[PDB]
Amino acid sequence: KRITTPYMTKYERARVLGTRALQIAMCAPVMVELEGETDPLLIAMKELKARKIPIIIRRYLPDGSYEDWGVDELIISD
Amino acid sequence: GATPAYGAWSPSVGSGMTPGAAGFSPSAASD
């Protein structure tokens, strides 16, 4: 019974991309094919379109609750 | 790597609509 927006917010998109790009730069396993690029943001962006980012977003509710959302779960905006 | 996952793949089935009659070849035994 998740009640939050099914869409990836611009802020989520920013920090997930940023966060994943950091991990990439730190020699993480990629979850997508590299067609021959080297930028960690470029990679992260690619991964994002593939819905292959190994990240879940813990969204805190004002009452104190929270809802966890996989990256593949929610609707990517841009 | 140059050689990714091959067998981890998802074989997508193809849908169709062919309302044909029944004039095709019969089955056989399994032995």
Place this chain on the structure above:
Amino acid sequence: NMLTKETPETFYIGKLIICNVTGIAHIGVKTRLDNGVTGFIPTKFLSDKVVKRPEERVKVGMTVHCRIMKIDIEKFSADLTCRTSDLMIAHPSFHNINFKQAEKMMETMDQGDVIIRPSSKGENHLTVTWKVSDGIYQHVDVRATLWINSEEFEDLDEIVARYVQPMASFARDLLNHKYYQDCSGGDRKKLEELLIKTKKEKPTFIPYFICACKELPGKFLLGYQPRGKPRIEYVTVTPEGFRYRGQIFPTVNGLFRWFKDHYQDPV
């Protein structure tokens, strides 16, 4: 005693004694050893004919580990051996190799022989390449994700005879089919143009064939023309059977006997 730094009783014959032969007197390299023993290289270790240095030494002098063959640290000699030898039907190959150069050695074996090679991406990984067809090979990149244990790596004999040998026996049956082809590797442009040419000679009897891919090995192509439109159905070969519409058949015959009474639906 206690002034020479080393006697001949410490240095023995058979054990490798590193000799520092950094000059040569008149052929061989006369240098110092680790214990201060004046290492005078003999014809069995310094090996210089007066026309050259040792050749197995350096570019600007002599030296190296050698097999100790003389104990003369008090005699200003060192019998250190300059030679490296003086100091001391479904087959299964072994290896330690790249991908491009491995493709040239796996074309000459027959159908069924499985090779063993390290992986290329990642660590502590092994790739199981087994022969499929003429130029078709499935490189089982285990972690084709075939999840295994850690206990099995010491014996490399069962991972093939439980996962690849039955897979090779199931893949060989479709090769010896009565209607098989290659279409130059299983090209998708060459297979749609064959079904439309075989339907004209016999519009009543519809034939079927079977082929595999070259770029996606392990997946077979089961094409059939119920009407004037080509249609392609895929099937995966498994170590326990075949994966066709998600139903696992134990024997190779039950797949065709299940297809002859399933392709007559309108879909």
Place this chain on the structure above:
Amino acid sequence: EEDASQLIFPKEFETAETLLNSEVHMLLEHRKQQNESAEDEQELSEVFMKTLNYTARFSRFKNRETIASVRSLLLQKKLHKFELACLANLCPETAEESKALIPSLEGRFEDEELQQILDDIQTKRS
């Protein structure tokens, strides 16, 4: 303040699970079994290697049944958890030895009740 003689234990330790000397021997030797039965395995720590022996010296039994029975014959009575191990390792040949050793048994029980607990323990002894 911490004296097990007067049965005073910290809250972190009050809820703790007591263990027998013979009982832990099975846990440790099974952990040895799990790891030594693994190929490609790193050598276990000197702390592991120096302790396996200790419980071995004091194995009143090995058997998986006696690991339970010296506990069941005790839990039926109104003993402390702390009393569970000290009385099941030592195996004091009489309630008198146990009451001399253990200050908490003194006046706690009939000597003959405690002696029968200890006799049941002796008759479990290999």
Place this chain on the structure above:
Amino acid sequence: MFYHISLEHEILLHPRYFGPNLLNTVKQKLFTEVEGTCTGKYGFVIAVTTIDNIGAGVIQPGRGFVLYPVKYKAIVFRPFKGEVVDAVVTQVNKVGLFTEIGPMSCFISRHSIPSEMEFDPNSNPPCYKTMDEDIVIQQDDEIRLKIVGTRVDKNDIFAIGSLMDDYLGLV
């Protein structure tokens, strides 16, 4: 004394350890972190026997690490003062006797020894005999004791034994 308790730990993991072996790698990192250690709270943990669960790994903002609160089961060894234990006699010396309580060693002065158990340095083996040579208490003997004082030394337990109580000897 040997106990079983549930402990907890939070471990840091670098992005190179992500991918299919991830939670296996989390188990490996704990098994080689908290084994054979000691604390001033819980005491000397002998081994982690199993892992209860992994709490979802909280990705560290700014840095690529993720931390994993793993709950685990531990056989812990915590002596208390006043407990009556068995041990083996290690070294017999005029300054005191040395024993060994599993991962923890103890020491008994002639002060704690009544005058019955006299020294034996004339003998090849250092023992503690009596006047008549009936009660022979030498090295490598299962000699009971009573922990009369605890001491932790930088993740290292060091108790102290005694021989004041009766029935503190051979079984």
